[PDB]
Amino acid sequence: HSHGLFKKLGIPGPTPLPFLGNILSYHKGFCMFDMECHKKYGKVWGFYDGQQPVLAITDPDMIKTVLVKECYSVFTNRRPFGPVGFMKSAISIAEDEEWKRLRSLLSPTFTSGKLKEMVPIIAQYGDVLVRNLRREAETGKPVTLKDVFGAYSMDVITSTSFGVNIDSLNNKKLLRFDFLDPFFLSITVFPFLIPILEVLNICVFPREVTNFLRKSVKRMKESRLEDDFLQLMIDSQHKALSDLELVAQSIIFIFAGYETTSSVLSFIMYELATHPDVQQKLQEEIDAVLPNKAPPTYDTVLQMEYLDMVVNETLRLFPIAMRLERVCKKDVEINGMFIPKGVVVMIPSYALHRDPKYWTEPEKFLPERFSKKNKDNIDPYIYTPFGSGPRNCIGMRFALMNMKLALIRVLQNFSFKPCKETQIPLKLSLGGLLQPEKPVVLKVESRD
Amino acid sequence: HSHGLFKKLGIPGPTPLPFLGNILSYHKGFCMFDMECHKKYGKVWGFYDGQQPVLAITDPDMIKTVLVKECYSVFTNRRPFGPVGFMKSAISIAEDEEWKRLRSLLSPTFTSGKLKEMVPIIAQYGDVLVRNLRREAETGKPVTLKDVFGAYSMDVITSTSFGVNIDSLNNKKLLRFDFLDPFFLSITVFPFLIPILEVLNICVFPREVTNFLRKSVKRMKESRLEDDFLQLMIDSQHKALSDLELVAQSIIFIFAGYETTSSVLSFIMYELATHPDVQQKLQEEIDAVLPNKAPPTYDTVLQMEYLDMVVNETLRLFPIAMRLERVCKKDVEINGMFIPKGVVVMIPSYALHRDPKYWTEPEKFLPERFSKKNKDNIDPYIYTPFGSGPRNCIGMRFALMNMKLALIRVLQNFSFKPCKETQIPLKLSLGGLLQPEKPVVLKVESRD
Ligand code: HEM
Ligand code: HEM
Ligand SMILES: CC(C)(C)OC(=O)N[C@H](CS[C@H](Cc1ccccc1)C(=O)NCCCc1ccncc1)Cc1ccccc1
Ligand SMILES: CC(C)(C)OC(=O)N[C@H](CS[C@H](Cc1ccccc1)C(=O)NCCCc1ccncc1)Cc1ccccc1
C-alpha cells in the first residue's frame, strides 16, 4: 500500500517487508536502529512502522521548522496513540485546538514562581531519601538505585500533585504498567484494532487506578471546598477544565514525574560512581555553595554550574524519550523537501546526541561539553533532551529542579562506589524504553 | 460511551440502545424515521448511528450556516466513508484541502459553456431513446422505466465521459454494485472494521472495474496523445491531477450520472402518467417552443418554464440524496447552539420537502409551487435537491440539462399512460436509497 512512498520521493531507507514494514529491525531497540540508519543513509531517511511511513530528519534547520516554526500549522500532534479511552483529554495525547487549550491552561502551573513555592516542601523528602539511604548504607548491602530513587520520585509526586505525604519505601495503591510487551508490538502491526479496543473500553491504562484517582481527587476537591498540582488545577477551573480531564492530567503527571525522574537519577549516579573525579568535584561545589550540609534552596540550585553540567551531559548520553515525533497534517515542503500528509516526522534524539560529527568522543562521559565556555557551541536542535518548540516538555523546569534537589542532599551525605554486581559498562535495554538492562546497583558510603 | 451527549446538551431525541444506538429505527427507511423525529421532537433532535452522534437541524438560518457560512472552516467533509481504497482521492470522498483542490480543478469542467458544447452530442442519444422506445411501444408490451431510462443514462455517460458510443439497451463491461445490504448495516454497527478492510485491499468498489477503467483511460489518453469529461480532465492536468485520481473521478461520474438520472426520470414519468393534465400541458409547451418535433437545443431547454416546474416538483417529492451531512471538525456554537467536535450534522431533505409547515398539501404533486410567481416564496435552505454551499452538487447543471433533453424528445413522440401492473401509488423502498419498491411500469403510446 504505502510501502512505495519513500521510493517515489527519492528518499533512501531500508526496504520494508509486507505488512511488517521495517519493524523487524527493532530487534536491537529503537536506539541501535536509529544509529545504523543515520550511518547508512545520511541526513534524511524513511522507514515503515508497518504501514505507517516515518520520515527521519537530522538537519538542525529542518528540525527547527518542524518543532518550532510550523508547529501550530502542520506538526501539531504526535502519532495517534490508543486505545486510550477517557485519557484522550490528556495533554500529551490531545490534538490540535484541544491540546493548544490544555497547554495554555497548564502553562502557568509550571512557572518558576510556582516551582519555587514547591521547593521547601520538596526538600522534605530529600531528607527522607537520606535517612532511608542511611539504613541501607549503614549495612554492607549494595543498593538498587531504581528502588531507592523510585521511592523518592513517588514521594515527591504524591506530595506535589495531591498533598499526600507517604514514605513509599517504608509505607499508596498506585499500580504500575509495563511499556514493552507483545502488546504495542502487535498494535504497530495491527493499528486497525485501536478503534476496536476503544469501543470495548479496553484501555491501555487499567480502569481501577483511574477510578481510584478520580474518586480520590473528588474527595480532595470537596474537602478543600470548602474548609500542589491538584490545587493549581482546581484554581484554574478556553472553557474551564472538566473533572474527567483534570484526573487525566494528574495521571500523566503521575507517570511522567515518577519513572523519568527515577531513571535519570539512576543514570546520573551510575556515571558519578564510574567517574569518581566528577563525583568529588560535584561534592566540592555543593559544599562550597552549601557549607555544613546546608539545605538546598531554589536559588542555590541554580547557582551550582558543575551540577548542571553533570545533569545535561547525562541527558545527552541517556535521553529517555529517544525520539521526537510529529504528524504531518498537510502537504508541505520545508527546507527544500516535500513531505506528504500523514507522514510521521521523527527526530532521532539518541542518534543525534551520539553523532561523532557533532560531539567529540560521543560515547564518553565528559561534563565539560556543557561548561559556560562550551555551552554556546551546542545547537539546541541537536541536543534535545526535553524536545523543542511549543510542544516540548512542560515539566522541564520541575524535572531539573527535582533531580538536582535529590542529587545535592544525596551527595551532601553519601559517596557512591561501584560494586562487583554493578553492570560496567551499563548496557541499555534492547526494548523500546531508555532504561538499563540490569538495574544499577552501587555501594553507598557515608561521609561521616 | 457517547450515548450521553445529546442528554448532556439538552437536545431531545430517541433513547439509544447500547452498541446499536438508534439504527433499529431504520426498519422503515431513513425517510420515515426522519419524518417521525421531526414530528415528535421539533426543530432540532439527535440520534446515534451506533456510537456516532448525529445532530439533525431544520432551521433555514442554521442550515445556511452549516452548508454555506461555515463550510470551509468547520463543516467541510461528509461522514467518513470506507473502505474506499484508492477512491480516497474521489471528490465526493476527499476531505479538507484535498477536496478544495479537487473542487477547483473540476469546477471549470461543469460550466455552462462546457455543458452547451455537450448538448448536440447528447441530443444524439435522445433519438436512440425514442427508436428503442418505438420498438417496445409499437408492441402492446408495458415498459419498465428503469431499464429504458437506465440504458439512456448509461448511453449519455459513456459518450460524455469517454467518447464511447454504445446503444447499451441493444449492445460495456461496467459491473454494478448494490447499496443496501447487511454490509453497510454492519459497517454502521462496526465502524472499527473500516481500517481492517482497507489494509486488506477490500474495496467497496470491486477492483476489476477500477482496473478496467484505469487501463481503458490510459489507452484513450495515449491514443489521443498524440493523434467529454475525460478530455476536460486531461486538458486540466494546486499541483496537477494524478492518473489514479483521474480514473477515480470518472468512477464517481459513472455512478452519479447513471443511477440518479435514471431514477428521477422514472419518478417524473410516473407523475406525468398519473397526472395526464400535467403531461398534456408539458407537451403543449414543448410543441410551442419546438414545433414539428424540432430537436431541442441548450437555449430552448432553458426557455421551457413548465418543464422546469415539473422537474423541480418531482425532486421535491423524491430528493434522491434524502439527507445532507457534514462532520463538525471543531467545537462551534452556531445560531445559539453549541455543537461538539465529531458530531455529524444532518439536514433531513426528505422530511423538510414534505413538511406541512412549509408546503401546502406536501404529499400532492403540484408543479405550480415552482411557478415564476411562487418560486420567490421558496426558501433555498428548505428545498435542497442538489444540496447547498461550496460542496453542493457539482453536476447540477449537467443533470438538469440531461434529464430535460430526455423528457423533451420522449414527450415529443410518446404519451405515457398507467397500466394494471403500475404501482399506484408509488411506495418508496424501505431501504437506504430513494428508489421505488416495485419498478415503475407504464404504457407507452405513440403520437402518430
Ligand atoms: C528528566 C526528566 C524529563 C525529561 C528528559 C523529559 C523530556 C520530555 C520530552 C523530550 C518530551 C517531548 C518533547 C517534544 O515532543 O517536543 C516531553 C513531553 C512532556 N513532558 Fe517531559 N520530561 C521529563 C520530565 C517530566 C516531568 C517531571 C513532567 C511533569 C509534568 C513532564 C511532563 C511532560 C508532558 C506533559 C509532556 C507532553 C507535553 C505536550 O504534549 O504538550 N515531563 N518530556
Ligand atoms: C437529478 C440528479 C442529481 C441530483 C438531485 C443530485 C444531488 C446531489 C446532492 C444533494 C449532493 C450533495 C450536496 C451536499 O452535500 O451539499 C450531490 C453531490 C454531488 N453530485 Fe450530484 N446530483 C445529481 C446528479 C449528479 C450528476 C449528473 C453528477 C455528474 C458529475 C453529480 C455529481 C456530484 C458530485 C461529484 C457530488 C459531490 C460534490 C462534492 O463532494 O464536492 N451529481 N448531488
Ligand atoms: C513510549 C511510547 C513511544 C510507546 O509512547 C509514548 O511515548 N507515550 C506517551 C503517551 S502515554 C503516557 C500516559 C500514562 C499515564 C499514566 C501512566 C502511564 C502512562 C504519557 O503521556 N507519557 C509517558 C512517557 C514518559 C514521559 C513523560 C513526560 N516527559 C518525558 C517522558 C507520548 C509521549 C511521546 C514523547 C515523549 C513523551 C511522551
Ligand atoms: C448512500 C450512502 C449514504 C450509503 O452513501 C453515499 O451517499 N455515497 C457517497 C460516497 S460513495 C459513491 C462512489 C461510487 C462510484 C462508482 C460506483 C458506485 C459508487 C459516490 O461518490 N456517490 C454515490 C451517490 C449518488 C449521487 C452522486 C452525485 N449526486 C447525487 C447522487 C457520498 C454522497 C453523499 C451525499 C450525496 C451524494 C453522495
Curated annotation (Swiss-Prot), chains A, B:
Enzyme class of the recorded protein, top EC level: oxidoreductase
EC numbers, comma separated: 1.14.14.1, 1.14.14.56, 1.14.14.73, 1.14.14.55
Source organism, top-level taxon: Eukaryota
Cofactors that this protein relies on: heme
Coiled coil: none
Mutagenesis or variant effect for S186P: In allele CYP3A4*2; exhibits a lower intrinsic clearance toward nifedipine
Consequence the record notes for mutating P418S: In allele CYP3A4*19
Activity modulation notes: Activated by cytochrome b5.
Result after altering I252T: In VDDR3; 10-fold increased activity towards calcitriol; no effect in protein abundance; decreased activity for non-vitamin D substrates
GO biological process entries: aflatoxin metabolic process; alkaloid catabolic process; androgen metabolic process; cholesterol metabolic process; estrogen metabolic process; lipid hydroxylation; lipid metabolic process; long-chain fatty acid biosynthetic process
Tissue expression from the record: Expressed in prostate and liver. According to some authors, it is not expressed in brain. According to others, weak levels of expression are measured in some brain locations. Also expressed in epithelium of the small intestine and large intestine, bile duct, nasal mucosa, kidney, adrenal cortex, epithelium of the gastric mucosa with intestinal metaplasia, gallbladder, intercalated ducts of the pancreas, chief cells of the parathyroid and the corpus luteum of the ovary (at protein level).
Consequence the record notes for mutating R103Q: In allele CYP3A4*8
Protein topology in the membrane: Single-pass membrane protein
The keyword Transmembrane helix belongs to this UniProt entry's keyword annotation: yes
Catalytic activity of the protein: an organic molecule + reduced [NADPH--hemoprotein reductase] + O2 = an alcohol + oxidized [NADPH--hemoprotein reductase] + H2O + H(+); 17beta-estradiol + reduced [NADPH--hemoprotein reductase] + O2 = 2-hydroxy-17beta-estradiol + oxidized [NADPH--hemoprotein reductase] + H2O + H(+); 17beta-estradiol + reduced [NADPH--hemoprotein reductase] + O2 = 4-hydroxy-17beta-estradiol + oxidized [NADPH--hemoprotein reductase] + H2O + H(+); 17beta-estradiol + reduced [NADPH--hemoprotein reductase] + O2 = 16alpha,17beta-estriol + oxidized [NADPH--hemoprotein reductase] + H2O + H(+)
Pfam families: p450 (PF00067)
Keywords of the record: Disease variant, Endoplasmic reticulum, Fatty acid metabolism, Heme, Iron, Lipid biosynthesis, Lipid metabolism, Membrane, Metal-binding, Microsome, Monooxygenase, Oxidoreductase, Steroid biosynthesis, Steroid metabolism, Sterol metabolism, Transmembrane, Transmembrane helix, Ubl conjugation
Gene Ontology annotations for the cellular component aspect, listed alphabetically: cytoplasm; endoplasmic reticulum membrane; intracellular membrane-bounded organelle
Functional summary from the UniProt entry: A cytochrome P450 monooxygenase involved in the metabolism of sterols, steroid hormones, retinoids and fatty acids. Mechanistically, uses molecular oxygen inserting one oxygen atom into a substrate, and reducing the second into a water molecule, with two electrons provided by NADPH via cytochrome P450 reductase (NADPH--hemoprotein reductase). Catalyzes the hydroxylation of carbon-hydrogen bonds.
Family from the record: Belongs to the cytochrome P450 family.
PANTHER family cross-referenced by the UniProt entry: CYTOCHROME P450 3A4, CYTOCHROME P450 FAMILY 3
More info: Chimeric transcripts, characterized by CYP3A43 exon 1 joined at canonical splice sites to distinct sets of CYP3A4 exons, have been detected. All are possibly produced by trans-splicing. The chimeric transcripts exist in 3 different combinations: CYP3A43 exon 1 joined in frame to CYP3A4 exons 2-13, CYP3A43 exon 1 joined in frame to CYP3A4 exons 4-13 and CYP3A43 exon 1 joined in frame to CYP3A4 exon 7-13. The longest chimeric isoform (CYP3A43 exon 1 joined to CYP3A4 exons 2-13) exhibits 6-beta-hydroxylase activity, while a shorter isoform (CYP3A43 exon 1 joined to CYP3A4 exons 4-13) does not.
Protein name as catalogued: Cytochrome P450 3A4
Lineage: Eukaryota, Metazoa, Chordata, Craniata, Vertebrata
Gene name tied to this protein: CYP3A4
